[PDB]
Design a protein around this ligand. Structure first.
Ligand SMILES: *[C@@H]1O[C@H](CO)[C@@H](O)[C@H](O)[C@H]1NC(C)=O
Lengths: 351, 49
């Protein structure tokens, strides 16, 4: 035998020992999944809810901008609907983590907005379109309005994007916990602690609490080191929650004022161009529920021993090799800690 | 059975320009569209005899 230390005779062969090892693997993975399920479902639910809530906010803001275009500038529709839809589509794509340039969103918005303003509002009456698009930026027709919107929306959209990325990475590490493969030495120690008693012909004998403690602190030496970074992750997320609804909803007022500003200099502009051409409650409840799991990695071996059958009295128990009266007495983890360090730096730099 | 003469071709919307779908069959007395599993409202259909 290579796991079961044969002190007397033995009722199990090498193949039964391999079966016990695989059942030990399955039992450990199931215990980790049961430990991580509540927190995993919490973060998954909140990620989904916040995603839907942000999409609702973006849709409502696009609807409000379209409605104020319908009401105040009917001459700009239906072209106004095209560039508003493209703008808020790129907004949502940026919120959901896609490579979108915020400055490019605002600049394409004003680039599309200026030619229809010139053709329908200032000089009523397809190839000359690009000359107007160039003149928009060359003559700075919109003044400081584009940079104002640029900073106003970049500030909120970056914090929202990093909030969603942080939720997703928390899901990732919590998903990794229950798929953490362990050492072979730990496999043999778990097999001895849970099953090798059956090879010696014992039916209901449980391992000693102290033996479970030494085994668990033996193979979770790496996993426990994640606790510092997980605590810093929780606290940095708390730092970030302490923003985007008001900005996207005031966008229509800002754009309306910018259109007024451009119409203010129409006299010179037409001649020159003719010649030239409950959310905050949710994130608060999420952080208050997430702070209940700050001890997750430090309490994990305690969970494995308190949910595995053990003799807490440490009397008439299995010590891994014999029935005693009293008890005598990683690459994936590195990746988890690396991504936690990265997301924590990103969080702290944001707030 | 009804034989389709002009089968509807996959359309693409460009710059928010709504492009209609054509359908012509003989012998046919009623021709309707089933977009994404469900029937299209009677008002949307424009029949030609
Ligand atoms: C919509 O229906 C009318 C009537 O049959 C037709 O004239 C037109 O081409 C259709 N438009 C589109 C977008 O297919």
């Amino acid at each position: 035998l290579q796991v079961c230390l044969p002190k007397g005779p033995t009722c199990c062969s090498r193949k039964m020992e391999e079966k016990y090892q695989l059942t030990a693997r399955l039992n450990m993975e199931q215990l980790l999944q049961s430990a991580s399920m509540e927190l995993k479902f919490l973060i998954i639910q909140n990620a989904a809810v916040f995603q839907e809530a942000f999409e609702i906010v973006v849709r409502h803001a696009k609807n409000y901008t379209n409605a104020m275009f319908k009401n105040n500038y009917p001459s700009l529709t239906p072209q106004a609907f095209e560039f508003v839809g493209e703008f808020f589509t790129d907004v949502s794509l940026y919120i959901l983590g896609s490579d979108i340039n915020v400055d490019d969103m605002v600049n394409e918005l004003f680039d599309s907005l200026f030619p229809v303003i010139y053709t329908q509002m200032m000089n009523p009456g397809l190839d000359i379109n690009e000359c107007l698009r160039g003149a928009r930026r060359d003559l700075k027709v919109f003044g400081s309005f584009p940079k104002l919107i640029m900073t106003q929306v970049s500030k909120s959209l970056q914090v929202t994007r990093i909030f969603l990325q942080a939720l997703n990475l928390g899901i990732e590490v919590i998903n990794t916990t229950d798929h953490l493969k362990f050492s072979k030495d730990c496999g043999r120690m778990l097999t001895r602690m849970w099953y090798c008693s059956y090879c010696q012909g014992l039916m209901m004998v449980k391992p000693c609490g102290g033996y479970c403690n030494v085994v668990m602190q033996g193979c979770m030496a790496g996993v426990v080191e994640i606790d510092k970074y997980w605590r810093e992750y929780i606290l940095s997320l708390e730092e970030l929650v302490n923003d985007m609804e008001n900005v996207l909803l005031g966008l229509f007022s800002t754009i309306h004022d910018s259109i007024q500003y451009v119409q203010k200099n129409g006299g010179k502009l037409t001649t020159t161009i003719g010649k030239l051409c409950t959310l905050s409650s949710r994130r608060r409840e999420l952080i208050q529920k997430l702070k209940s799991f700050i001890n997750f990695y430090s309490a994990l071996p305690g969970y494995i021993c308190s949910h595995s059958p053990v003799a807490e009295n440490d009397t008439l128990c299995w010590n891994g090799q014999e029935l005693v009266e009293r008890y005598s007495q990683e690459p994936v983890v590195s990746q988890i800690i690396d991504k936690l360090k990265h997301i924590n730096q990103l969080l702290r730099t944001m707030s | 059975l009804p034989h389709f003469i002009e089968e509807p071709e996959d359309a693409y919307i460009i710059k928010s320009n709504p492009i209609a779908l054509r359908c012509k069959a003989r012998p046919a007395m009623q021709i309707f569209f089933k977009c994404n599993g469900e029937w299209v409202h009677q008002n949307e259909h424009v029949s030609e005899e």
